A and B are shown apart, each in its own frame.
Chain A
Amino acid sequence: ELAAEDEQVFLMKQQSLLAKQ
């Protein structure tokens, strides 16, 4: 079952990406 990432979880992922940069 492929499900779109929630806004919160996708944005926590993007936060993790931005913070490490």
Chain B
Amino acid sequence: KLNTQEIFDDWARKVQQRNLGVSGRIFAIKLKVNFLPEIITLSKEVRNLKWLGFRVPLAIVNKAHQANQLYPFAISLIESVRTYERTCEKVEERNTISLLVAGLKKEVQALIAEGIALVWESYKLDPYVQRLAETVFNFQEKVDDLLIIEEKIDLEVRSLETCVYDHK
């Protein structure tokens, strides 16, 4: 009863039937990165199985290879998209600070527009990951600075209605 050959055969058959492939445009249109978490797990599903001695198929090995190469790039891209989405939600929820953060918004949108034409096979995909991180990094810092300053201005203007009626 303890033989696990059936489990390995079933898993290999399921993954082959899925026919997972990362090739395609790096983004698609909510913004998404065409790199699901599952493509990571298959690589690990090979990494342990090779230790267990099961002869994994060559195509599965190649898919694990592509997953391993593109996973850090996909994490950088999905982190950038998630940061942009949450920060955009924060900015939309507070319409007062929309004008100040206009430059970072148009910059990141322009970088995304440049990247729509890219593919996972593009050599320029890795330099774009470098480009997007810097611009998003600047956008986060300046937004953080304004929130500190804007609250102080909000408190100070709030002080005026209740402050003492003297010129000083």
Contacts and interface: CB of A to CB of B under 8 A. Distances in A.
Interface of A: 1-4, 6-7, 11, 14-15, 17-18
28 contacts: A1-B99, A2-B98, A2-B99, A2-B102, A2-B106, A3-B98, A3-B102, A4-B88, A4-B91, A4-B92, A4-B98, A4-B101, A4-B102, A4-B105, A6-B92, A7-B30, A7-B88, A7-B89, A7-B92, A11-B29, A11-B30, A14-B29, A14-B31, A15-B29, A17-B29, A17-B116, A18-B28, A18-B29
4 closest A-B pairs by CB: A14-B29, A2-B102, A4-B105, A18-B29
Interface string B51-68: 000000000000000000
Contacts of B31: 14
A1 to B, nearest CB: 7
Contacts of B105: 4
Interface residues of B, number: 15
Max chain A C-beta neighbours (<10 A), residue from B29, B91, B99, B101:
B29
Interface of B: 28-31, 88-89, 91-92, 98-99, 101-102, 105-106, 116
* Majority SS at the chain A contact face: helix
Contacts of A11: 29-30
A4 to B, nearest CB: 5
Contacts of A1: 99
Contacts of B30: 7, 11
Contacts of B102: 2-4
Contacts of A2: 98-99, 102, 106
A16 B150 CA distance: 37
